[PDB]
Design a protein around this ligand. Sequence first.
Ligand SMILES: NC(=O)C1=CN([C@@H]2O[C@H](COP(=O)(O)OP(=O)(O)OC[C@H]3O[C@@H](n4cnc5c(N)ncnc54)[C@H](O)[C@@H]3O)[C@@H](O)[C@H]2O)CC=C1
Ligand SMILES: NC(=O)C1=CN([C@@H]2O[C@H](COP(=O)(O)OP(=O)(O)OC[C@H]3O[C@@H](n4cnc5c(N)ncnc54)[C@H](O)[C@@H]3O)[C@@H](O)[C@H]2O)CC=C1
Ligand SMILES: NC(=O)C1=CN([C@@H]2O[C@H](COP(=O)(O)OP(=O)(O)OC[C@H]3O[C@@H](n4cnc5c(N)ncnc54)[C@H](O)[C@@H]3O)[C@@H](O)[C@H]2O)CC=C1
Ligand SMILES: NC(=O)C1=CN([C@@H]2O[C@H](COP(=O)(O)OP(=O)(O)OC[C@H]3O[C@@H](n4cnc5c(N)ncnc54)[C@H](O)[C@@H]3O)[C@@H](O)[C@H]2O)CC=C1
Lengths: 329, 320, 326, 328
Amino acid sequence: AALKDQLIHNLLKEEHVPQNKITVVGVGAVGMACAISILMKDLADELALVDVMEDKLKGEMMDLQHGSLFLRTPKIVSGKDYSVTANSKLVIITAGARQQEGESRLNLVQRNVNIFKFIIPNVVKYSPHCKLLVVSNPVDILTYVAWKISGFPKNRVIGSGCNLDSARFRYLMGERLGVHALSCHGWILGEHGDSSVPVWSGMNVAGVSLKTLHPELGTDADKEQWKQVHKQVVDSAYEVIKLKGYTSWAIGLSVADLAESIMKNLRRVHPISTMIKGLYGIKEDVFLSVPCVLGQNGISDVVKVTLTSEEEAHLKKSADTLWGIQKEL
Amino acid sequence: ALKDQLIHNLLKEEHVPQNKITVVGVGAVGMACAISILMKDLADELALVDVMEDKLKGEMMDLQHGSLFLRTPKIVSGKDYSVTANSKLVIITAGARVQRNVNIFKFIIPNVVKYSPHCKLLVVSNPVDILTYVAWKISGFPKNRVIGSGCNLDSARFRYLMGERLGVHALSCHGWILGEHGDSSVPVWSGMNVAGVSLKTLHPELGTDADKEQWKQVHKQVVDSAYEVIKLKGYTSWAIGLSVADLAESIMKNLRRVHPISTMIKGLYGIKEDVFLSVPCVLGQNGISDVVKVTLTSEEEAHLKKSADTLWGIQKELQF
Amino acid sequence: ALKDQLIHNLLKHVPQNKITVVGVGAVGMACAISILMKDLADELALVDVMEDKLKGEMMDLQHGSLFLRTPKIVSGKDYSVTANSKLVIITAGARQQEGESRLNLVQRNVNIFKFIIPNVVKYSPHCKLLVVSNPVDILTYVAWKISGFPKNRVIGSGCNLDSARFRYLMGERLGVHALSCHGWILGEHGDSSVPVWSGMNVAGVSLKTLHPELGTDADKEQWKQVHKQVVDSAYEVIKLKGYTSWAIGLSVADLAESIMKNLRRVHPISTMIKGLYGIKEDVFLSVPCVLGQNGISDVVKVTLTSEEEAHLKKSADTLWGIQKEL
Amino acid sequence: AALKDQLIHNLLKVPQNKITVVGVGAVGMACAISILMKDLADELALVDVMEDKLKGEMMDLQHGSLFLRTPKIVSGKDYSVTANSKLVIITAGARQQEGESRLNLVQRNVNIFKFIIPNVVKYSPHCKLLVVSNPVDILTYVAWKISGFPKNRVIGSGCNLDSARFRYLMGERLGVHALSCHGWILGEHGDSSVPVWSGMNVAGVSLKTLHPELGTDADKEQWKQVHKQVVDSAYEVIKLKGYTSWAIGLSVADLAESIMKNLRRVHPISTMIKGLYGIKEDVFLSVPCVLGQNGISDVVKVTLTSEEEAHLKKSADTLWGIQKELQF
Ligand SMILES: NC(=O)C1=CN([C@@H]2O[C@H](COP(=O)(O)OP(=O)(O)OC[C@H]3O[C@@H](n4cnc5c(N)ncnc54)[C@H](O)[C@@H]3O)[C@@H](O)[C@H]2O)CC=C1
Ligand SMILES: NC(=O)C1=CN([C@@H]2O[C@H](COP(=O)(O)OP(=O)(O)OC[C@H]3O[C@@H](n4cnc5c(N)ncnc54)[C@H](O)[C@@H]3O)[C@@H](O)[C@H]2O)CC=C1
Ligand SMILES: NC(=O)C1=CN([C@@H]2O[C@H](COP(=O)(O)OP(=O)(O)OC[C@H]3O[C@@H](n4cnc5c(N)ncnc54)[C@H](O)[C@@H]3O)[C@@H](O)[C@H]2O)CC=C1
Ligand SMILES: NC(=O)C1=CN([C@@H]2O[C@H](COP(=O)(O)OP(=O)(O)OC[C@H]3O[C@@H](n4cnc5c(N)ncnc54)[C@H](O)[C@@H]3O)[C@@H](O)[C@H]2O)CC=C1
């Protein structure tokens, strides 16, 4: 008989019920950066990949499968049909058009809204209890779209948002100050995009307020021009796009950070995109980034940041920008 | 200045990296190696080198933007190999995708060796066995410090495929692909086992044409795998990145694990020429310190001699 | 109230990857710290009868929360804290005095299991039960009979540790890491364990092929003394520090990892072997088992020499002799 | 030939990331297991005066080698096993109160450090020295004076665990993970430590701005009792289980990670603070310190109230007072 039966006595007929399954929609540059970061952080016991082109999809799956010896995720699967995503805890959406050199994320909206009308109903059919983590751009507006299409409560529809902007800001802050980004605390809120809002009043190392030490922090009168650090954050993706054509590694690591807080129910605070109506002075159904408590139920809580009136005004302008696109959909 | 208002410096520090790694070539393979090494915390400094200077700065910046999520505090890049100085390990992934990559290595290797005279050289560029030889000749390093990624990946693929057929994890499926990376590689059917159970003793037709289960086709699938993935997505990157990081881990942590990697094998296995082939090698902080002597069948042994002769035939035609 | 000034609550907790440890002694806490540092659980629950020591171990772990990724640690003498565990690890009971056989602990620990196990089942009726308490093979059988669980879900830590010890000693003799030295110790976790000399190999190279007298009394290199060292290891360490903890901690966390991540790795662990290897009784002992999210789904059929086979049926005989009395 | 030579052809005839733990008690072995499970070392050495216990602990760890990525674990009462360590962690000594000030009791652990520290220096002269034994601020000073090391290479664990406990307690009250709560306990380890109310925050939101009574007796939420609770937590755990081990071991492994990976994270740890914060004596107090491969290279200058400043100055004076009476 077969070698497998010569070698192995089967004791147990098992139907596969996945316990810690994550799906990545889209095996482009971002989706595969998300995939490898999730795999190398041991967050899922099953990873499912979905996309619309079957060759690319099978190719990426096999390339990951070939490294199984080096991973601790035993089941990696893929298909064009969303049945392969069934019963995911977390579904990460990365499908969509990306920026050309110099193009605004907001110029992607018509193309990717239409894509979400195809994707989101399919996701929700097969993982009705999942958390949705939207990465595709413009991420704030597409989290809104995923919310309206899915019918999920707002705690379960999350945009990757400014987790990455805040990481970029902290890295640049640490380079100037000579400490690790981990030890530099500062928050970028609002749109993941040109209208993001640096919260100068909250920046600190070891609880020492930087704006107290350096009162011109964040103003145009500042001899050190710390405002150009936030400008570098705004410009960073256009700079990397100009240089290598796209961005991938940093967002993949940022998404895997968020995925860890969800899958392990850490209730860590992250600046991510959520439905902010009734807070921070905002009256419309806009999604933008504020500090959110993130765990196994998604966003359970929002932190109420004490913005200066000018920081509050920048945040309102960010909301108004997003609502100006949102109202046309 | 905010820095001085906030921080009182108590010590003048010279940057002397203690666990530095360099990756040469930031293509699909090099960046897969880079992200794997970063996510395994194997270096305190990562250096990147390429000739495409825009691509190089963009890749470096993209990794840097993820520092908050990593525990590698310094990531640097440049076309000038001064950025690679004092690396413990230098990984070569540059090149087309033989004579084209020899000509490249003629510029790369002397630059690497100038700035990190004591490093281990890990060659991934293809054809990996021939270019490890080239790197060895050009560097002047002793053979323990020149390593080809070789059949480490081939063996991982083999173990994945064996596991999917047997219903167990690749980790629990043991099997060795030796010799040349790619077409002429050698599946050592006699060593294949789960839990120390010899699959060839259990299933005597293992590895033969008369095998009703066609296990020989699993080797063909390993041989063919890079071509099938290239046909489907255009190149391979993730599996090789992870296997290079596995090697890097054994080197950086002095683990003395056994891997099937490409080493200068003259004087062993009946081989009489200066060729690099994969055999099981003990890998640690001095590179390859010891070679395991596998008991090969008479024509497993003949097949491995054929690879030697094949590789030697190409090496004789090299200009450098 | 500061919390409400700081935090707008949006949303009114079922743990998804919970692990319980019963017995927060030397072994239990080694298992706990090892599982915590491997990020295998989203909730860890601890149970003991000594309520003060229980609360103190819990608090000491909790104080390290900043450095961990397991956000909830709970404890109590009441087993309600353990509800909805995927995995429950039994490390409670009497341990060996210097020179004492593990089999001598059986009467005391059967008694203890009679209260423990029904309370575990009560709160986590679908968990996998990983028994560590000694004698581990007989107590896995006991846990199975008391719990009513199917055999796939009652696991004894068994010879995972013996084989790890064996591979460390082999690697030290061969100059390579334990990971690259392969070798299986089967049967009783104790004096009657069985080294499978025919499977010991590096890179698929059988040592017995180079050295057919390996492991036998005719071996000038005395490789049989390596197995003796494995047999004696627990006794030597008890004599030296009074107990063993760290290695079994790590071995249990290895097993936990295969279970919690559904790895289907093969481990030498204690299972109901009736009708394999020629055995006709309800004995538990270690053979190579495929370990995943449903526990033990498959057993590898190892081909033993006649002597290895005889030694395993003697190990089997030595057990059961005790089981039948209970 | 021998089996090994039949199997393996030797082709080729100094550890790079070695760590030593001195004292294999409750604290020392928690440090060891945490450091092993974080893959920070290529070699781990253990030293104690109890030779049986030492061999037993070493063997127990070795038996777990298969499950680790640290390939060499060594032990001995002779310090030759510690040679070439990057980091040496001192956990040896009598168990004593965090703030212990009584001279007879202090001097007992000073005497132990007189035997340990020169032997540590003998074999790892370039190491960083990490002192955990109590009283930690005084014994870090003693280790510095006996070792002859520059101050950047002598580190007291100080208030590093205190601040982690404080962040745990903050998170339990606020419903977030300790990682997302920020707060700093500084100064002299023990009853005299200084909770810096001004820096406590979540997401950069100052709790003291939202709750101006934070840290006063009139505060109806009694946040000042959270500091008392930190200061008393070790004693409460001792009362319950007889000693403490797991949290300190984790916090020491976190420091070691910063050192071994050259991370330059900021930790509240005890450093030779003369010349800063108005302090004029050779004392060790916890301040936010940048910790990397060369130890403590930089300190954050925290803006303190006049009273917080006075507290630190008085800690300096009383530590210096004790130190003057020590014999070594
Ligand atoms: N911080 C953030 O939120 C960032 C989000 N990014 C966005 O991520 C998305 C994907 O970027 P990349 O992966 O680099 O792009 P890519 O070109 O590499 O891949 C596009 C992906 O969308 C998938 N897709 C599915 N359906 C369609 C469709 N009808 N048309 C086009 N594509 C489809 C496509 O098959 C492919 O998987 C873009 O919207 C980017 O703007 C880019 C980087 C970071
Ligand atoms: N198992 C193995 O050994 C494998 C080896 N592989 C080989 O890896 C190599 C690279 O593959 P890819 O990454 O996909 O190719 P790629 O085209 O993505 O990247 C090649 C990189 O080399 C760079 N390069 C070229 N010349 C120089 C130079 N003189 N100095 C520095 N950099 C230079 C080039 O700019 C480019 O960024 C090829 O030889 C592949 O065949 C492919 C995958 C597996
Ligand atoms: N490889 C293996 O299988 C290993 C098995 N070991 C066994 O592990 C068990 C415990 O060893 P140690 O931790 O060192 O002993 P320990 O004395 O340190 O702890 C035992 C713990 O069990 C607790 N306990 C006793 N009765 C109950 C009860 N009814 N309910 C809950 N808890 C209870 C007891 O209070 C104590 O905290 C012994 O049976 C050992 O023989 C020791 C090491 C290896
Ligand atoms: N938060 C902190 O900073 C903590 C510091 N702690 C202190 O850490 C120290 C040790 O505590 P425990 O581990 O619980 O005590 P322990 O009694 O369990 O271990 C102390 C060890 O030091 C060893 N020892 C004594 N003298 C020497 C010597 N000359 N050379 C080598 N070894 C020696 C002793 O043999 C013993 O193995 C005490 O000073 C404690 O008060 C306790 C816990 C936390």
